[PDB]
Design a binder for this molecule. Structure first.
Ligand SMILES: *[C@@H]1O[C@H](CO[C@@H]2O[C@@H](C)[C@@H](O)[C@@H](O)[C@@H]2O)[C@@H](O)[C@H](O)[C@H]1NC(C)=O
Ligand code: NAG
Ligand code: NAG
Ligand code: NAG
Ligand code: NAG
Ligand code: NAG
Ligand code: NAG
Ligand code: NAG
Ligand code: NAG
Ligand code: ZN
Lengths: 194, 584
């Protein structure tokens, strides 16, 4: 039996700090038909060839997708330290993974366009001695997710719960919608096969 | 306890300040890059909100006596809030002081000097300064010099006399001896063993540093005088002081403009890469990405995406009015920007690195408490900025980038010309700064009575700087008030220390990079070890004594002029042979 990539083809893709994760097990997947629906701009895979990803039996498959501008590709790379890799999303390289940056074409009408591209610029605790920053675990969520869920109306707007403080940066989306996918494979490994 | 209450008060102060300061800074930025009436009024309302909050919070910090505070950081932040300042004056005197300050600033800003023989030709400050910076005629410079001295500075004497007494009254109200002591207190710290510094100790420190530096200035002064004697025959004595109006600028602050008549050999052509930059199709974005690449090569972080999206790097094409002055902005909540209208030239190439050095220093201590996000003292930020432009300007860096051909030939003549130009810019201004601050300190203290302000001033001008006035000036004149920093109430010692520190940093960064040969040929690029020990000092902010921060990088607690003399060793050795026995 196969599995549907329809949940990632409907609705408005979430922002980077609130990315959406799909887990697939015991499915006959077709990756060649998924990337054909997008205008793939970048495909960089670690510990697996881009062609080698499409074939082979894995124990589990994971897809973390969010809305992310392609010109910010340099801030999502390994070895780069910044707000994106610390307060928003830190890729886990323990398992074979690939990162895809693709632009949604006009044909895809089931994907709604979010009003703005948004991310976090800081997430910390405050004390008389300064700021104690909080950093994401590889593949995990920011501790300031509950505060960020209130939404940001302007750039560098901050939300505070008395202990945690978070700041958000937003900017309007121009043209088509640019999306980011992180595909991780985990190795019984006969569950998920092409 | 009192310390726990101080800690929670500071926690809530930080919480509110982090929002109010960014709002004020954003309003100011929106005004500066887009000049209009609405932007000005929004800037004013944001500034008023911040000022009211800060005053109401400072009224609360007075309830925590510092004798019961032990932590060196809570006490440090409470010392900043508890300051009174001009609020110690008796209501009427504060308004009178504000009126005097505005009157002096307006009088300076509205200078106007007319030609004695051509009354139709009247020049403002800018067109008058352009005359001094390019003229080569004795009387044409002399009438400009005397006119500016007797037009703007002559009417600031009655205001300056009252300014001195009101500033002394408020400083004595702030538990100081005088206003010069108030200014000197910016260098005072507390420490355990040798990390403490006094405001009664800066005077002798700068005195001994100037005594160390004076033998180089004597050689440079003798060389410049020997060349000027040929430039202006029959007006300069073979062994006398240099006339005041012939030293390039209005006040003789910098001797750079003398380079054209002081260059050792006109045959040797200076390095210029503006033509190559235009030929390779460079832009503002390419210049700033090259600067970011240079700073990343030594292990410092890259720029935030908001820096690239929000900063203004070129003059707008929409015709918006912009205050075009190169500035670096730390607006608050992880928001760093640069405002400069760049062109494709070498000077802009160096200023990009300077401003990015400012930005990197700002990014370093971004996690400190609000009141402790500054340099260790007033000279650290500019020294850090300039120590990068020191390394960038080297032909080794340009050759590595490819901005000049790899077949470029480096001979000792070019090294001597480069060192001489730098000494004209750098060494030639230290005596001016030293004597100006010394005169101000003596005036505020009271060692110079009001009846002999000029008699002493020019006297010092002949003993420290070696400069003689062209015309006698009575006590109706106030020549030092003719300067910007004097009429506009600015401290001037910042420029004396920020040079002494500068080279003290550079040598420390060239010993760690394992540099071989002369110090002026040192490039710290592709050296993560130098960046590590640099960021060790940059991360401290204002939380430590500036002596501890100085030791973190330069491995010394005391400012020394030996690195500055070591930088200019080849020039000194050449100048000694050129002058012979003419020094004096
Ligand atoms: C502010 O940051 C200080 C130093 O930064 C931290 O330590 C260095 C060694 C690195 O690990 C760096 O990534 C860290 O950010 C802290 O020592 C200091 O405690 C911080 N301020 C507060 C209030 O916690
Ligand atoms: C996967 O989808 C592509 C889309 O064109 C199709 O050509 C291919 O046959 C599919 N492979 C399968 C179902 O194994
Ligand atoms: C799909 O996109 C193509 C290329 O833009 C266009 O020609 C075609 O009409 C689109 N189809 C639909 C159903 O919108
Ligand atoms: C400049 O300020 C005016 C004030 O009305 C504003 O409308 C305009 O958008 C601003 N220009 C910009 C941001 O380019
Ligand atoms: C500031 O003035 C107040 C009285 O208005 C005084 O209690 C306080 O000690 C002064 N602060 C300092 C630091 O001297
Ligand atoms: C530091 O304090 C000691 C002892 O009080 C004093 O002798 C010394 O002069 C101080 N250091 C400086 C640099 O002023
Ligand atoms: C020095 O000469 C150069 C040409 O080599 C000229 O551009 C510059 O303006 C001159 N400077 C002065 C102060 O005369
Ligand atoms: C730094 O190293 C890189 C690669 O190792 C080289 O291309 C570059 O020229 C070097 N920079 C300098 C200023 O020598
Ligand atoms: C440069 O060195 C040469 C020999 O290499 C020497 O003859 C010449 O005098 C030197 N010139 C200067 C300006 O120091
Ligand atoms: Zn600067």
């Amino acid at each position: 039996q196969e599995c549907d990539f329809t949940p990632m083809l409907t609705g408005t893709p979430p922002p980077i700090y609130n990315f959406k994760r799909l887990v697939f097990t015991n499915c006959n997947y077709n990756l060649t038909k998924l990337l054909s629906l997008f205008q793939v701009s970048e495909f960089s895979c670690h510990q697996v060839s881009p062609s080698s990803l499409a074939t082979g039996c894995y124990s589990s498959l994971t897809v973390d997708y969010f809305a992310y501008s392609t010109d910010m590709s340099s801030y999502l790379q390994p070895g780069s330290a910044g707000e994106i890799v610390q307060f928003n999303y830190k890729q886990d390289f323990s398992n074979p993974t690939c990162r895809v940056l693709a632009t949604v074409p006009q044909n895809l009408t089931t994907i709604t366009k979010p009003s703005n591209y948004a991310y976090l610029t800081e997430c910390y605790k405050t004390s008389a001695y300064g700021k104690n920053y909080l950093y994401n675990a590889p593949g995990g969520y920011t501790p300031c997710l509950s505060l960020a869920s209130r939404g940001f109306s302007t750039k560098y707007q901050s939300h505070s719960d008395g202990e945690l403080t978070t700041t958000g940066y937003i900017y309007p989306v121009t043209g088509n919608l640019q999306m980011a996918f992180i595909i991780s494979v985990q190795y019984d490994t006969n569950s998920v096969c092409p | 306890t009192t310390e726990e209450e101080a800690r929670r008060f500071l926690v809530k102060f930080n919480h509110e300040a982090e929002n109010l300061s960014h709002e004020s800074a954003l309003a100011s930025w929106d005004y500066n890059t887009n000049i209009t009436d609405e932007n000005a009024k929004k800037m004013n309302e944001a500034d008023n909100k911040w000022s009211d909050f800060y005053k109401e919070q400072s009224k609360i910090a007075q309830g925590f006596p510092l004798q019961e505070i032990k932590d060196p950081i809570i006490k440090l932040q409470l010392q900043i809030l508890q300051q009174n300042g001009s609020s110690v004056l008796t209501a009427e005197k504060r308004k009178r002081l504000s009126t005097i300050l505005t009157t002096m600033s307006t009088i300076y800003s509205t200078g106007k000097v007319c030609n004695p023989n051509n009354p139709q030709q009247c020049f403002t400050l800018s067109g008058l300064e352009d005359i001094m910076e390019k003229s080569k005629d004795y009387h044409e410079r002399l009438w400009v010099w005397e006119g500016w001295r007797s037009e703007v500075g002559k009417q600031l004497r009655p205001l300056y006399e009252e300014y001195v007494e009101l500033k002394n009254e408020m400083a004595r109200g702030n538990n100081y001896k005088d206003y010069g002591d108030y200014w000197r207190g910016d260098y005072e710290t507390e420490g355990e063993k040798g990390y403490n510094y006094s405001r009664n100790y800066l005077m002798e420190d700068v005195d001994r540093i100037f005594l160390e530096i004076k033998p180089l200035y004597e050689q440079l002064h003798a060389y410049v005088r020997a060349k000027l004697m040929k430039a202006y025959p029959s007006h300069i004595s073979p062994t006398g002081c240099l006339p005041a109006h012939l030293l390039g600028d209005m006040w003789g602050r910098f001797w750079t403009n003398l380079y054209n008549l002081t260059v050792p050999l006109e045959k040797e052509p200076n390095i210029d890469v503006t033509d190559t930059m235009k030929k390779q199709s460079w832009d503002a974005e390419k210049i700033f990405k090259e600067a970011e690449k240079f700073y990343s090569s030594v292990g410092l972080p890259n720029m935030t995406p908001g820096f690239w999206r929000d900063s203004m790097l070129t003059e707008p094409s929409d015709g918006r009015q912009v205050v075009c002055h190169p500035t670096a902005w730390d607006l608050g909540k992880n928001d760093f920007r640069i405002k400069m209208c760049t062109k494709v030239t070498m000077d802009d190439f160096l200023t990009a690195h300077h401003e990015m050095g400012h930005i990197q220093y700002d990014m370093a201590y971004a996690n400190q408490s609000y009141l402790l996000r500054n340099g260790a003292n007033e000279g650290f930020h500019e020294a850090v900025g300039e120590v990068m432009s020191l390394s960038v300007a080297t032909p080794k860096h340009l050759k590595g980038m490819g901005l000049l051909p790899s077949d470029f030939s480096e001979n000792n003549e070019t090294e001597i010309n480069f060192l001489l130009k730098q000494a004209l810019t750098i060494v030639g201004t230290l005596p001016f700064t030293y004597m100006l601050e010394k005169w101000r300190w003596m005036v505020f203290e009271g060692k110079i009575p009001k009846e002999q302000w000029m008699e002493k001033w020019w006297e010092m001008k002949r003993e420290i700087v070696g400069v003689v006035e062209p015309l006698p000036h009575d006590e109706t004149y106030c020549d030092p008030a003719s300067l910007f920093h004097v009429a506009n109430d600015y401290s001037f010692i910042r420029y004396f220390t920020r040079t002494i520190l500068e080279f003290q940093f550079q040598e420390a960064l060239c010993r760690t990079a394992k540099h071989q040969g002369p110090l002026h040929k040192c490039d710290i690029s592709n050296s993560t070890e130098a960046g590590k020990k640099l960021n060790d000092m940059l991360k401290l902010g204002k939380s430590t004594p500036w002596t501890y921060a100085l030791e973190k990088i330069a491995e010394t607690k005391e400012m020394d002029a030996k690195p500055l003399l070591n930088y200019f060793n080849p020039l000194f050795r050449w100048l000694k042979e050129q002058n012979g026995n003419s020094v004096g």
